[PDB]
Design a binder for this molecule. Structure first.
Ligand SMILES: [Mg+2]
Ligand SMILES: [Mg+2]
Ligand SMILES: [Zn+2]
Ligand SMILES: [Zn+2]
Ligand SMILES: [Zn+2]
Lengths: 131, 113, 263, 523, 133
């Protein structure tokens, strides 16, 4: 019964990251040694008009960024492991995320590395009003 | 209260095919009530698409039975190799009781999705 | 009773130190067993009884219990024989084992555990919890425990005999904890290790694996003790013993002799 | 295609709101417009749903530079015996709020330990995932009925993983510095090892120096085997797949071929023991290799020196006692004389003749069935060879397989697998073999001068007061010392005791007697 | 048998010995455990005593009126009042023998289990008055 969920092109990555002790560094070492990034993420459809703020309640892209199903970007939420947020749940479960179309091939890697500036609400570098 | 089928239906592999001669060789899975008057078979289980005839020698092995078959039953049992489609073949003209008995034995014996 | 340093008054019950404890306990045990059988047979419906002879037994039992007034030797005789055929007992002091018909018991013609519970309740003023009353169906492996020994069915020589084997934690505890500081130093006392090994022997036939290792550990200990003893003796004074005949203590036929019926 | 990995098992039929659906295949289809997703504000996100997530089919065969392999080859496993531990698990199916997955229930290892754990699984919530307790039931198989009572005797998992770390730690602290699990139905065991395993780059212990094999989640620190109390994760196990090695049916029928010892009491540890027994057979019951080495753990070199001394002495004594014409050596692959000078004719036999010295080392596989009536001249010498009943003339030295020590490890089938340097496998021990011989009684033969000062004979050689009746070393009469002989006797007695406590047993032809050594002594 | 001791529970709660919520105090029936069960049982002594007194009165009247018949337990309500003369017979008055063997013989253990005669120790068998000196 049930419903299948992952395509065979993700088995090694998901296993090796669900057994590791530091999921983040594990995934970074995986990529950094010739790995194929994760890839059945849910992809949205919208207007590419609105705030550049990736974290949002409703797909709000610009002509450059690209809306994604948030929950399917938190690696922690993807491998079914616990989150390092001291308390106590992932935030990207419920929202949408918008990633620069350039780097928006690997969503999980970006979500791991970059962060939104608290002021401009946008990615530090893509872009930020601060300084 | 009332129990339905204190059941002794073991399993055999035998012959079956699309026509009386298309009954080739060892590819059928028969459930058999080995009654008083010989081994009486009830249902046939295979992965082959559809087969109109099974071919099993008599209780004395003289003639090979020419038994036309039900339209196969569709269901997806599972094994370590994931899903596995199988087809259940009833001998056409079977009362509800033997249907129920065969279904009980099979479903309690083999896992489905 | 002179407990502490003052005299009290013992209300009742035995004082388990007099001249005849084990035997009086055996008598009391048989009494309770017979009482339970009687209650079982009398508290069952008559019409449900199939056999005519058994309705005759129950009927005349009610007779000889309440209607009659003095003894009737033949009834006692045939009832005692009935019990000896469908209840067979083995009694050491307050410690019993019963080999009984099973279908009779199911029908209610002899006593099962529930009857013992009821009898103890109204005639002993205690509640026998059912977590302490074992039960066995297959007669190969024997009684589940008797006199704090377990039974195992082992093929010895050319036939299949029963053997008793203790509880391993008990033997190890006995090995580690003593009650005098000269019972420590194994050098002086190897004899008690011999006795302990004699008690531990039948473990060797156990299908498990730590269990046999208990016995083999004891043997190797004895060897170690003898070696260090000769060493010490040669050390303090220079003599070496002339003859020992102790080598038969660390070799496993001296022990298995004890469970071979020919003495 | 798809896999069974992370296959959902919830009974509800509706897909998930894309913003809380882990993948593009586990979304619902109203949002599925041409493989893409469109948010339909007519429906909101659920705020209560609990979907169990099956955890089977893990498939781990990666290549990262900082991380060590988890499945090792056959040679890397042969090298690291001492560290093998069987493993088997029993299962249970999920019932009401989900169906289609198994949960670990009873665990069993090569040691006779059996742990039971309450059924727990990985559940989701609108905010996160969750490790919680779920309801289950045993398999409908009849032979699995001995599992019905176990479903109410479980333990919370943390207790179980702590107990596991502790059991391993005090089984292996004195042998290896790792652990390799031998297993059969590889998949489900790998599934179960999600509960208490954690992998990652190689690390060294804290407050000790050996490689670290434990993890603590609370304090976040590692440990070796010795200093691991309160830690609850194995940090880098290794594995092995016995059935991968080209085997056919269930391991029951396969094991049943050779070992008639390990029966099947219906648990899991039984399967573990059978698996390890089989793995030992497949790699060790052959002929012994001489290229494989092992570290010493420990004290072993004393046992070796003792074996040297005792061999030299016993053979010299037997020769000088009976003066055999020919010495039929047996089982010696290197034609090296034990006693260095001996006028007796000295053969060499073996079932493995080397290249050189093959002209010396005649090929010979002994068996009393046949060669019983062949070497009826002189005497044989079965040093550590393993045959059936020995001929009535011989000087056998055979390792008893019943002793306990950390050197010999259980093998098949009842015979154990000694490990000193190169692992020797010896068959089971029995008495029928020695039906022609008798235990060598202890003694000590010397033949040399004495103390000195005197350097002559009666009576100017230094005497101290040793009174023992078995040091057959004239000069000796009760004062029997000549210092030299005395402390030599002490040394050799110590060595003999150590050797024979290590496990080895001695035997001699029935004709032996000590007196004729005295008769030799009279000069 | 603690698996189905329901009728007993009903008697105890009916005659105000203890009250229902007690029976969830697990191990209520045990003797070594929870010794208050002795008091709870003892609360039936007075009623058991009244039963015996009334049995004596009936035996008196039955001998006086010249009647013969076996007395049994299951013909007496828990107030002592008898009934059910099924197979009594007739004789000259003042010459009727009531049979009381099975009755007393079966009743016996309950007398000490429920501490029946504890009324006898009072100043005049009257539970309110002090103890005899
Ligand atoms: Mg089993
Ligand atoms: Mg199993
Ligand atoms: Zn998350
Ligand atoms: Zn900003
Ligand atoms: Zn450490």
């Amino acid at each position: 019964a049930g419903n299948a969920t992952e395509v065979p092109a993700n088995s090694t990555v998901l296993s090796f990251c669900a057994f590791a002790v530091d999921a983040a560094k594990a995934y970074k070492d995986y990529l950094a040694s010739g790995g194929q990034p994760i890839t059945n993420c849910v992809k949205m459809l919208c207007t590419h008009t609105g705030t550049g703020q990736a974290i949002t309640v409703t797909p709000e892209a610009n002509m450059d960024q690209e809306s994604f199903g948030g929950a399917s970007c938190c690696l922690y939420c993807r491998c079914h492991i616990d989150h390092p947020n001291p308390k106590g749940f992932c935030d990207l479960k419920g929202k949408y995320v918008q990633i620069p179309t350039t780097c928006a091939n690997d969503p999980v890697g970006f979500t791991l590395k970059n962060t939104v500036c608290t002021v401009c609400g946008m990615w530090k570098g893509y872009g930020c009003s601060c300084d | 209260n009332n129990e339905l089928s204190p059941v002794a239906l073991r399993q055999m592999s035998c012959a079956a095919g699309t026509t009386q001669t298309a009954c080739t060789d060892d590819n059928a899975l028969a459930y058999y009530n080995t009654t008083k008057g010989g081994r009486f078979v009830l249902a046939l289980l295979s992965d082959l698409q559809d087969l109109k005839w099974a071919r099993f020698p008599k209780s004395d092995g003289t003639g090979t039975i020419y038994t036309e078959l039900e339209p196969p039953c569709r269901f997806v049992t599972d094994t370590p190799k994931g899903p596995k489609v199988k087809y259940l073949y009833f001998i056409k003209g079977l009362n509800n009781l033997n249907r129920g008995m065969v279904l009980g034995s099979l479903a309690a014996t083999v896992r489905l999705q | 009773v002179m407990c502490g340093g003052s005299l009290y008054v013992k209300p009742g019950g035995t004082s388990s130190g007099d001249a005849t404890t084990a035997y009086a306990n055996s008598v009391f045990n048989i009494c309770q067993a017979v009482t339970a059988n009687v209650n079982a047979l009398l508290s069952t419906d008559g019409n449900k009884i199939a056999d005519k002879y058994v309705r005759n037994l129950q009927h005349r039992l009610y007779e000889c219990l309440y209607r009659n007034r003095d003894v009737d030797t033949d009834f006692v005789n045939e009832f005692y024989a009935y019990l000896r055929k469908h209840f067979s007992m083995m009694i050491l002091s307050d410690d019993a084992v019963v080999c009984f018909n099973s279908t009779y018991a199911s029908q209610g013609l002899v006593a099962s555990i529930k009857n013992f519970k009821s009898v103890l309740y109204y005639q002993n003023n205690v509640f026998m919890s059912e977590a302490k009353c074992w039960t066995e169906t297959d007669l190969t492996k024997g009684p589940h425990e008797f006199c704090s020994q377990h039974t195992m069915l082992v093929k010895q020589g050319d036939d299949y005999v029963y053997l008793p084997y203790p509880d391993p934690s008990r033997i190890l505890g006995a090995g580690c904890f003593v009650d005098d500081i000269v019972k420590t130093d194994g050098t002086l006392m190897i004899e008690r290790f011999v006795s302990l090994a004699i008690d531990a022997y039948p473990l060797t036939k156990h299908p498990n694996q730590e269990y046999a290792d208990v016995f083999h550990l004891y043997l190797q200990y004895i060897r170690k003790l003898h070696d260090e003893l000769t060493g010490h003796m040669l050390d303090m004074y220079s003599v070496m013993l002339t003859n020992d005949n102790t080598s038969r203590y660390w070799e496993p036929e001296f022990y298995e002799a004890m469970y071979t019926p020919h003495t | 295609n798809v896999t069974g990995l992370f296959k959902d098992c919830s009974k509800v039929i509706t897909g998930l709101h894309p913003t809380q659906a882990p993948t593009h295949l586990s979304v619902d289809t109203k949002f599925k417009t041409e493989g893409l997703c469109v948010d339909i504000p007519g429906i909101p996100k659920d705020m209560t749903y609990r979907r169990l997530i099956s955890m089977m089919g893990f498939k781990m065969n990666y290549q990262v530079n900082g991380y060590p392999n988890m499945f090792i080859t056959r040679e890397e496993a042969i090298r690291h015996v001492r560290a093998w531990i069987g493993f088997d698990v029993e299962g249970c199916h999920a019932t009401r709020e989900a169906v289609g997955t198994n949960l670990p229930l009873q665990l069993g290892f090569s040691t006779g330990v059996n742990l039971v754990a309450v059924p727990t699984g990985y559940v989701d919530t609108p905010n996160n995932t969750d490790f919680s307790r779920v309801s289950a039931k045993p398999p409908p198989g009849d032979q699995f009925k001995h599992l019905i009572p176990l479903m109410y005797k479980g333990l919370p998992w943390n207790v179980v993983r702590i107990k596991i770390v502790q059991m391993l730690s005090d089984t292996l602290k004195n042998l290896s510095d790792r652990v390799v699990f031998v297993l059969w139905a590889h998949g489900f065991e790998l599934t179960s090892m999600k509960y208490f395993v954690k992998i990652g780059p190689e690390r060294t212990c804290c407050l000790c120096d050996r490689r670290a094999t434990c993890f603590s989640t609370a304090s976040d620190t590692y440990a070796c085997w010795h200093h691991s109390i309160g830690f609850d994760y194995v940090y880098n196990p290794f594995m092995i797949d016995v059935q991968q090695w080209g085997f056919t049916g269930n391991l029951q029928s396969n094991h049943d071929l050779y070992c008639q010892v390990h029966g099947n009491a219906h648990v899991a540890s039984c399967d573990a023991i059978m698996t390890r027994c089989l793995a030992v057979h497949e790699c060790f019951v052959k002929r012994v290799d001489w290229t494989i080495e092992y570290p010493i753990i420990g004290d072993e070199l004393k046992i070796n020196a003792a074996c040297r001394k005792v061999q030299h002495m016993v053979v010299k004594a037997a020769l000088l006692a009976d003066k055999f014409p020919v010495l039929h050596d047996i089982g010696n692959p290197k034609a090296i004389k034990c006693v260095p000078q001996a006028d007796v004719e000295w053969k060499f036999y073996d079932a493995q003749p080397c290249s050189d010295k093959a002209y010396k080392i005649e090929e010979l596989f002994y068996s009393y069935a046949t060669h019983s009536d062949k070497f009826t001249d002189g005497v044989c010498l079965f040093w550590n060879c393993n045959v059936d009943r020995y001929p009535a003339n011989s000087i056998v030295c055979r390792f008893d397989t019943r002793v306990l020590s950390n050197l010999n490890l259980p093998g098949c089938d009842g015979g154990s697998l000694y490990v000193n340097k190169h692992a020797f496998h010896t068959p089971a021990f029995d008495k029928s073999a020695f039906v022609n011989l008798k235990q060598l009684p202890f003694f000590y033969y010397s033949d040399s001068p004495c103390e000195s000062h005197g350097k002559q004979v009666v009576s100017d050689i230094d005497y101290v007061p040793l009174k023992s009746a078995t040091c057959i070393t004239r000069c000796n009469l009760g004062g029997a010392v000549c210092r030299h002989h005395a402390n030599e006797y002490r040394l050799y007695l110590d060595a003999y005791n150590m050797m024979i406590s290590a496990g080895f047993s001695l035997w001699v032809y029935k004709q032996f007697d000590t007196y004729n050594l005295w008769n030799t002594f009279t000069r | 048998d603690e698996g189905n001791c329901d009728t007993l529970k009903e008697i105890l709660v009916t005659y105000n010995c203890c009250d229902d919520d007690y029976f969830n105090k697990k191990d209520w029936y045990d003797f070594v455990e929870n010794p208050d069960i002795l008091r709870v049982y003892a609360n039936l002594g007075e009623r058991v005593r009244q039963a015996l007194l009334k049995t004596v009165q009936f035996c008196d009247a039955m001998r006086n009126a010249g009647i013969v018949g076996v007395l049994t337990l299951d013909n007496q309500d828990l107030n002592g009042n008898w009934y059910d003369f099924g197979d009594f017979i007739q004789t000259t008055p003042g010459s009727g023998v009531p049979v009381v063997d099975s009755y007393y013989s079966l009743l016996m253990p309950i007398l000490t289990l429920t501490r029946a005669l504890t009324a006898e120790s009072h100043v005049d068998t009257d539970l309110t008055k002090p103890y005899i000196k």
